[PDB]
Amino acid sequence: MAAIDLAREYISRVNGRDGSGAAALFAQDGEIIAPVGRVYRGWDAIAAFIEAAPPATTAQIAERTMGTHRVVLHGVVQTPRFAPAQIEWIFDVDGDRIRRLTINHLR
Amino acid sequence: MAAIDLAREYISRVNGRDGSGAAALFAQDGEIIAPVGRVYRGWDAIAAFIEAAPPATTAQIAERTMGTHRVVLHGVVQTPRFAPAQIEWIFDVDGDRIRRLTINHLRD
Amino acid sequence: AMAAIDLAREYISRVNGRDGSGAAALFAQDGEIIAPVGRVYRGWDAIAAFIEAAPPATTAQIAERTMGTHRVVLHGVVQTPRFAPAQIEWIFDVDGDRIRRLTINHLRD
Amino acid sequence: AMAAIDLAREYISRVNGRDGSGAAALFAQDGEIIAPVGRVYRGWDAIAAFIEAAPPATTAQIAERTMGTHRVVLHGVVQTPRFAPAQIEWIFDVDGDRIRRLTINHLRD
Ligand SMILES: [Cl-]
Ligand SMILES: [Cl-]
Ligand SMILES: [Cl-]
Ligand SMILES: [Cl-]
Numbered sequence: 001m002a003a004i005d006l007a008r009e010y011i012s013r014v015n016g017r018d019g020s021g022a023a024a025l026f027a028q029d030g031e032i033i034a035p036v037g038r039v040y041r042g043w044d045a046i047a048a049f050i051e052a053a054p055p056a057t058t059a060q061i062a063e064r065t066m067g068t069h070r071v072v073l074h075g076v077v078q079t080p081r082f083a084p085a086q087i088e089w090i091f092d093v094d095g096d097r098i099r100r101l102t103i104n105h106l107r
Numbered sequence: 108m109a110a111i112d113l114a115r116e117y118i119s120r121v122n123g124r125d126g127s128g129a130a131a132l133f134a135q136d137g138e139i140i141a142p143v144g145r146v147y148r149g150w151d152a153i154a155a156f157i158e159a160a161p162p163a164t165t166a167q168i169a170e171r172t173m174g175t176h177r178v179v180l181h182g183v184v185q186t187p188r189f190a191p192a193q194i195e196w197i198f199d200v201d202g203d204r205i206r207r208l209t210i211n212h213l214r215d
Numbered sequence: 216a217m218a219a220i221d222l223a224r225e226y227i228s229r230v231n232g233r234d235g236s237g238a239a240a241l242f243a244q245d246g247e248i249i250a251p252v253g254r255v256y257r258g259w260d261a262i263a264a265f266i267e268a269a270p271p272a273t274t275a276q277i278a279e280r281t282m283g284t285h286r287v288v289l290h291g292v293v294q295t296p297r298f299a300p301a302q303i304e305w306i307f308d309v310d311g312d313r314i315r316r317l318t319i320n321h322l323r324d
Numbered sequence: 325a326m327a328a329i330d331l332a333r334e335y336i337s338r339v340n341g342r343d344g345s346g347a348a349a350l351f352a353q354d355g356e357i358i359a360p361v362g363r364v365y366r367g368w369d370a371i372a373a374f375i376e377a378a379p380p381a382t383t384a385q386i387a388e389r390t391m392g393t394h395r396v397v398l399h400g401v402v403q404t405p406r407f408a409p410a411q412i413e414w415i416f417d418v419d420g421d422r423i424r425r426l427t428i429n430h431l432r433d
Contacts, residue, residue, distance in 0.1 A: 034189055035161060036318055037142060037251025052190035052215070077188050081164065085187035102318070105161045105188060107255060142251045142362025143321070144298065145268040146432055155264035159254040189253065209361055209427070212252065251362060270360065270430045271407055296402050296410035297430060298359055299377035324377070 003093035004063065007071040010091070010098065011058055019050030027097040034103040054079045058087075069093050074106070110200035111170065114178040117198070117205065118165050126154035134204040141210045161186050165194070176200050181213070190215065219309035220279065223287040226307070226317070227274050235263035243313040250319045270295055274303070285309050290322065299324065328418035329388065332396040335416070335423065340382050344375035352422045359428035379404055383412070394418050399431075 001009070006025050013022035023046040026032075032040040032049050040049040058075045065072035071091040076084045086106040092099050108116070113132050120129040130153040133139075138148040139156055147156040163186045172179035178198040183191050193213035199206045217225065222241050229238035239259040242248075247257040248265055256265040272295045281288035287307040292300050302322035308315045326334065331350055338347040348368040351357075357365040357374050365374040383400035390397035396416040401409045411431040417424045 033320065035253030036249045036320060037253060038189070038192075039320075049190055053188060054185075056188065079187045081185060082162065082187040085162065087188050103188060104249065105186065105253065107162075107257065140361045140429065143301075144270050144295075144360025144362060144430065145265070146270070147264065147268050148432065151260075152264045152268060155256065155261045156254070156268070159256050159261060159265075161253045161255075186253075192252075211358065211361060212364075214366075270432075271410060273406060294379075294406070295430065296381060296404045296407045297378060297412050297428060298363070299374055301363075324373075 001096055003069055003071045003091060004066050006093055006096075006098055007073055007089065007091045010101070011061060011073065011075070011089070014050060014056050015058055017050070017055055019047035022050050023047040025098050026101075027095065027099050030097065030099050030101075032101045032103065034101075035105060036102065054081065059084075064088075108203055110175060110178045110198060111173050113200055113203075113205055114180055114196065114198045115168075117196070117208070118168060118180065118182070121157055121160065122165050124158070124160070124162070126157035129157050130154045132205050133208075134201070134206050137204060137206050137208075139208045139210065142212065161189070171195075216312045218312075219285055219287045219307060220282045222309055222312070222314055223279075223282075223289055223305065223307045224277075226305070226314070227277060227289065227291070230266060230269070231274050233267070233269075233271075235266035238266050239263045241314050242317075243311070243315050246313060246315050246317075248317045248319065251321065270298075280304075326421055328393055328396050328416065329391045331418055331421075331423050332391075332398055332414065332416045335426070336383055336386060336398065336400075336414070339375055342375070342380060344372035347375050348372045350423050351426075352419070352424050355422065355424050355426075357426045357428065359426075360430060361427070 023043045032046050040046050057078045061075040064074050073089045077087045088104040088106050090102040117132055130150040138146050139153050140146050147153050163184050165184050167183040169181040171181050180196045182194055184194050185191050195211040195213050197209040226241055239262045247255050249255050256262050272293050274291050274293050276292040278290045280290050289305045291303050293303050294300050304320040304322050306318040335350055348371040357371050365371050381402045381404040386398055386400040389399050398414040402412050403409050413429040413431050415427040
């Protein structure tokens with residue numbers, strides 16, 4: 001699974017509200033930064049983030065950066081409480097797993 | 108405006124993404140202390156801190172302490188994508204204005 | 216015309232000098248700092264305010280982890296008069312000889 | 325048996341003595357040090373870790389600004405090798421003969 005394939009499968013997992021399935025894409029010492037300043041390190045914390053964050057339905061996913069080791073996706077997240085939000089997912093990949101995902105809310 | 112009213116109006120104005128209006132609740136040398144050890148002193152600096160916030164709603168407010176000069180609110184900040192955050196706002200109030208607001212993130 | 220590594224090193228030098236304006240001048244007009252917790256300071260005045268809000272601190276033991284034409288990662292130690300040393304990562308995205316975005320991640324102690 | 329002001333004075337004395345275990349033993353088991361705001365040391369192990377990692381720098385002219393049965397505010401000047409003298413504020417929340425929370429603020433000129 002290439003970096004772009006991991007990024008796409010992560011988005012698929014989150015759309016299914018499948019925290020454990022998303023966590024299995026990360027290295028054991030992988031982490032989600034969401035947002036900057038709030039870090040979820042390791043499989044348990046990553047699955048807990050997905051489970052605690054609102055139920056996500058993504059749309060209009062665009063691949064902004066794509067390489068063997070880094071992928072940037074931009075997309076729109078629809079949620080029960082807010083206007084559609086432009087979200088940026090920055091994936092750092094090594095060894096066929098995600099080492100770090102940083103999630104920015106674009107203004 | 109009593110301290111509890113200033114605290115409630117601050118939450119209302121941040122929910123409106125109104126940096127200028129939130130800042131006018133503070134004394135001219137009032138300050139916000141926020142992560143990590145950042146001190147925003149004065150109306151311009153407080154408005155900048157407020158305007159840097161993610162789009163969010165701040166609700167489920169519990170009034171933990173209330174007095175003439177100190178108010179503590181607990182609440183939940185929700186955002187489109189991130190997990191709900193438990194927040195504590197500690198308002199030090201003197202003479203109809205906020206002198207210091209300390210913002211503590213609480214355990215999830 | 217400063218290269219990305221030059222902008223990154225100068226940013227650190229300006230922050231050690233408490234110099235919010237000089238640090239802001241390293242950014243594009245619509246450049247930004249993303250800092251805890253999800254705070255985005257966009258534009259020169261906001262960046263200046265963020266920098267001025269820092270406590271007296273010195274930023275040293277810089278290791279240049281990544282350097283290229285358009286992206287720089289620095290790791291460093293921030294020391295203060297009373298608080299514990301903090302391990303910090305600065306990620307600079309650079310375009311057209313200015314910083315488009317600086318992301319500031321706290322690392323494990 | 326120790327009053328709130330006694331807890332605060334003993335905390336400063338144990339930190340000045342570089343005794344992180346002894347300072348932690350003044351706190352509730354789920355007590356915390358916030359130092360600075362946004363950086364939280366929860367529980368005795370983390371509190372000992374803060375004390376051991378923070379500068380040994382010493383509080384000299386400690387002033388007792390606020391005291392009561394459940395809250396104490398101390399102000400003092402800490403002098404460190406590489407900074408100007410720094411005005412520091414220690415805010416102790418006390419319940420049941422133990423420190424529930426200590427917040428450490430670096431006061432700005
Ligand atoms: Cl996500
Ligand atoms: Cl706020
Ligand atoms: Cl910085
Ligand atoms: Cl201390």
